[PDB]
Design a protein around this ligand. Structure first.
Ligand SMILES: [Ca+2]
Ligand SMILES: [Ca+2]
Ligand SMILES: [Ca+2]
Ligand SMILES: [Ca+2]
Ligand SMILES: [Ca+2]
Lengths: 376, 376, 376, 376, 376
């Protein structure tokens, strides 16, 4: 993930221009190899034509080049690329939105599961750990970075996400499927046991816990679905064929013919097809957006930070359910105890941001005395 | 379903170009017959123009070819194709999203339905089987593969989804409508009976169970709706006519005219219309995307694996409600029992994915001592 | 509703071509009259130009025809048609999604409202009938077929959807508004009475019933909103003007001028403007899609089957609440009672659909021993 | 709100053509003033060119006209208009979807709040009136028509929406913000008091009431947000300039130059620029769609009927909570008491709408005896 | 935020043209510097070509300009801008929709947390202050203005948002992540303590409170996610490159070539490239819309008023939970106590907005007596 929100906070002079001097997760880094290959092929063709062709062969090449440059359309490429990239971006944001966060569940567990003793600590930590374990199982199923971190369930046990007992239970339950769903059944059964044992004081609280856990399960299932059901290969191939055929044609169409022949278009013989290179950057970067975002759990610069998410979730959830359980800051009257209209101060840097409240678009409408009179 | 997520995890050199060497669920497999027909017709027309026609007939054909080429437009093909395929893909993903997964309901059943005896086992298994039976009924109504697997309710009984008693009950209830809704009424009544019998300890748990079952029912109803209410046939016919008229026009417009006449835009008689063939591949594959995705429950390569989903759902739900009920791994303190900030290790292959936490885009904003001062 | 899902299950040779032989709900049926009028106008103009006009008038008409062609642009018409039709299709699907299905409510009623006696039968049937009556009231307000079936509340009473007592109560309550909301208040009060009288054992069950009823009410309100708030007449008129101006400009710009004059684009004189007729079919069919779908509750072939929905809902809900209440198939051990991994068989037709489970995209990643070792 | 759903129910001959004869909320009514200004400017320029310019000045004007007509196509007017109007229409429908309806809350109040005496009547009426008061407060903040109806809180008191005591309470609570949120706090506190006083029999019922009230509050907050956060003024200005400069250029580029000069496109002097007027209608009406829908709470013909909504909501909610409380039609066996499959009759006008039930797309699949045999 | 809803309430004459006279948040203010740079470059090139070079160099430059003019195409830039800006606008609206409002939670707290004594006041104020503190923490993480107002937790304490005890607790809990999640755990634990102490009378009320708190937490998490996961930098660079390449090729292809050469499209020398500057306006203004909305929490004119939102939320929530708790206006019969159909009056300015109720689109259908008869 490359963040530039602070850089694009305000629309200043050359706001997006300054972003062109970025390397990580950039168009240059994404397409430099493809551009080098295209440039090498283009100049090899130019040489071959200008040095290894007789007069008749040169005339044939000029006719073919004129025909190729004639038969090239940007409309299909722009349409297909725009629609495909829009679909890929929508799926990318959906996949992020289906990343499970244990915050709601951890707050509920910390609040509801009672007991400051070892048994209560164990119960809360085990519940939050089951949530984290389900999340990590799905994450290592769908993300290459997470899989490389935890290439095996033994690695999961070594990292502390799973205990040897949980590992043995999983191996005993093993089916010929992905077993990322097991920790949710474990969580449901453990919560039912906690309620039956008095640790959870109420079936309403039990239902809230299970609703949060089921929301997490739905998110993990959506992640699995996005991993499994790829965008149609036919659609991907159509977009790729359009984009690549455009520049395969350009390799011959955008060739500087001999100026001596005074062809209408090919009057001035440059050496660098600058506009063709600009088109290459534009279209191939548009395709590279989809190439990078199609699987957002790879190891691209703009791919999600799944390992950091896992670490943060584990630490935060464990802290919330163990250290922060029934550990509140002292409750005392605040600074505005007897002030009906509190007004927090502004600093010098923010004094300009003090704005009058918006009272509605009809606030300033003016009406006459006769107009405002109710009729009988 | 064809999966290439592992192949497109990272945006590497020629990432999408490498996907062009795939056969299953590919543009070639989808449109090779249409392309062969188009090629045959095109070359038949070329041979007729070259041999059969006399001088005047050939001149008339050349004028007709110039006019037909002049009247080929791709804006009012690209526009309609893009909009139609976007609609089809949206409906395709919605149809997948409405595939019922019994995971949430199965966790709820395993937790809530009490009793480790034969009666409890039977009750839990019957509830989960009612859910699975409803899912399979809708799936065999909407999916050709599932129908081929279970072409009759007797087949469903033989497969184990339905018991003979349930089959008899369905026969008794038979109405002149699709009876996929009956298992949900059965589930509601059985849950009420279980709660009245003490197996479910609270109406709150009963309500959670029924909410999950009703979510599954809504998903099945959406599947039925998508099966019944097809995309408007007028819209489909409009798209089909656009594409087919474009290429029928190309059949005459893209003929290679005699170089002897030296017309403005041919000047060179190749035998293969390479750009016309590329356009055919592009546009016909764009159409074939919608052709394959319009019914995602057929037997295409990229259609959903409904039979695998059915088998997996049956296995997982039965295991969860039968063997996993009140069967938990031993609860013991974890590896980070007294560690304030757990830090799971990284392997050598994943050490580069360790990142500092993102603290917000305002973290690096710098202010002077006077700027940060609160004002009165 | 025209269904061709079975026909388009698989992407076969000419899958969408086979759909061009359909008449019901087809582009031909939709626009044959408009095409006839356009053809008549075009050929009247052509015959006037060919016979009635003198030499000077014919030269003037040739100038006008050559001048008209530059104003026949397709980019804006395609843009406006695409966006308008996308909006209309989105609204059409939303309108179907707001069609009320009493399945969830009926399952809840059958489960919760207790009593196999006459009083319980009457209570359950009355609740489900209130739901169906509200649905039918909204449907007859918004659908021409349902209105023609039930042109009056007396017709509703005769058809059995309403009792004479309910009709008298509605007439007593009559306000100067659509009274489709009354049955929901009736349902709420009757459910409260049932709970107070012991027929509903718990306020949790009562709340579930009322949540389902309120979901139905929201769907009915959305149907009313779609019926009332039409797409802006300005937008509809703008799209209509675009299409009509395009095709009335074509009436003069697509006339085949005297080939003798040797104008740049009028060498060939075909009596039939095939490409103009193709464009007419394409664009007027695109507009006819919106014309048919703008009101999905009319009597078009692709309009919804509201009458069938009403009949099916009544029958299914009555059966579920009355005969299916606490009438369950015998609970007995299933086929896989003691089979840890059930495996339903495949028929000869579906044997090829047996697929291995998808374990994730990271399953096949290869790592060395050094790569998989944890670092300290 | 202009409704033409009945007119566009069926896709008949000239369905959208017939809508071109409408005046209210029509393109003519929306843009006749702009069209008159444009016509006046166009013909003033025509007379200036034809009567006030010498030979050289007329030659210069003709060159300018040809230049403008050649370079007019540089305006991305269709693109900008489509992409802007789509957003405007989406926001328009969202704003409608956020209009609060008290139907669900009123049914809940009528059912739950008990007591047929004066105290219960007062309680239910006060709750529903708090809901209506919050709705009307937000509506008068965001709607010009509602503000004109109720230009002050004293007007609200006179209209009966608020009592003098409520007005005094609002004045006492006055903060420098919009006080549309106060009635929701009042509703919550009154519901809590009613529950504590025995008028509400269960905290579950109290929670249902508060959930409905909170949904209404969220809708009102969305209305406030839409009123406050206008569409980007930069975007609106870009679209406005794009549309206006097009016709400003047309004023000179679409003039009829002297036919004596025999310019390529100016051989005929047909005084009226019919195609330019058609373009004006198309583009300016496409912009008028956005101009009318950008604030759907103004006084346009297609703007929402906020005053009618307010009146209807008040009447319906008061009736439902006061007259309809525990006032049900007599409950008796219905027409289909012992009919397993009720079949409501059809009229002569609707007999053709009786259809066979749709049983799925796989229903008609035919398989041999061997294909259907289960395999081992 | 710049609001013009009142100005655009009605679609009046020149409604959108009257917005072109605004400066704040305007296209002029956004792009005047870029336009000045473009002007300087264009006229530098013009002066070089006119009087800097010999005749041979002038011919070379003329050929280069005539070549460049054919490469600038509107469709690709327009499409990329449309898709990118649509994505940016959608994300901008979602970001606003994720702004946390404490109104629902504050009403629930005021209703549910009992006690008019100091303990009750402290409990309610502390809960609402925890909600406001979480909101402010996320807002100062994501918003430049809020960060400038509260550049440190000490600033938060001095402003009254956090007590010294809460600051100490946050320091003791400090983890290497953003700690905005802590107040939600605090809220859960404090609500549990209040329920166990009798201040909250029912676990259902506790669950409602925690549901509202969790909704706020999810909104804050979405704000953090939008702050962290920027739109892909590759996509941003692609759009920027498209725009800049277009307007850099324009710098040479839009030069007014010598009219004496009588080039095909350069017969007039206007000095000022009016249409090129109009295109710059349109496209750079589209890009500036995207640039301004990409980070809606910066300090642009059209960025959100986060500081005002913070102040208003604090004041309103404190008032609601402290002064408005169990403080209701006197309950008395309203104006329409015994009026079956209340009819609030209309003023003279709004009398024209009184409309008849819409009874449905089928209301006016006319049927004969024989048509309306039921068939057997
Ligand atoms: Ca990736
Ligand atoms: Ca298919
Ligand atoms: Ca219709
Ligand atoms: Ca308006
Ligand atoms: Ca900004």
């Amino acid at each position: 993930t490359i963040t530039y929100t602070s850089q694009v906070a305000n629309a200043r002079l050359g706001s997006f221009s300054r972003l062109l001097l970025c390397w990580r997760g950039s168009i240059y880094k994404l397409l430099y190899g493809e551009f080098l290959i295209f440039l090498l092929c283009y100049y090899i063709i130019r040489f071959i034509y200008r040095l290894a062709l007789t007069e008749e062969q040169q005339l044939m090449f000029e006719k073919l080049t004129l025909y190729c440059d004639s038969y090239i359309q940007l409309i299909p490429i722009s349409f297909v690329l725009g629609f495909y990239v829009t679909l890929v971006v929508t799926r990318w944001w959906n996949q992020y939105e289906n990343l499970p966060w244990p915050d709601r569940l951890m707050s509920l567990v910390s609040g509801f599961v009672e007991g400051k003793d070892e048994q209560g600590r164990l119960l809360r930590r085990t519940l939050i750990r089951y949530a984290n374990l389900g999340n990590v199982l799905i994450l290592r199923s769908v993300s290459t970075a997470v899989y490389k971190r935890f290439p095996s369930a033994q690695h999961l046990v070594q990292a502390g996400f799973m205990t040897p007992a949980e590992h043995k239970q999983l191996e005993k339950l093993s089916l010929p499927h992905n077993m990322f769903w097991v920790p949710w059944v474990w969580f449901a059964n453990l919560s039912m046991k906690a309620w039956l044992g008095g640790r959870i004081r109420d079936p309403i609280l039990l239902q809230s816990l299970l609703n949060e856990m089921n929301t997490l399960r739905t998110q993990c299932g959506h992640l699995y679905a996005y991993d499994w059901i790829s965008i149609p290969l036919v659609y991907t191939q159509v977009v790729t064929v359009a984009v690549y055929s455009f520049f395969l044609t350009c390799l011959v169409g955008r060739q500087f013919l001999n100026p001596a022949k005074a062809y209408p278009g090919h009057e001035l013989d440059l050496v660098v097809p600058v506009f063709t290179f600009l088109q290459f950057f534009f279209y191939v970067g548009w395709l590279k957006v989809a190439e990078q975002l199609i699987n957002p759990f790879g190891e691209d610069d703009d791919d999600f930070e799944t390992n950091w998410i896992v670490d943060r979730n584990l630490q935060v959830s464990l802290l919330a359910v163990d250290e922060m359980h029934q550990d509140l800051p002292r409750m005392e009257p605040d600074m505005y105890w007897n002030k009906p209209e509190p007004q927090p101060p502004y600093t010098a840097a923010s004094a300009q941001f003090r704005r009058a409240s918006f009272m509605g678009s009809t606030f300033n409408i003016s009406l006459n005395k006769e107009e405002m009179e109710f009729q009988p």
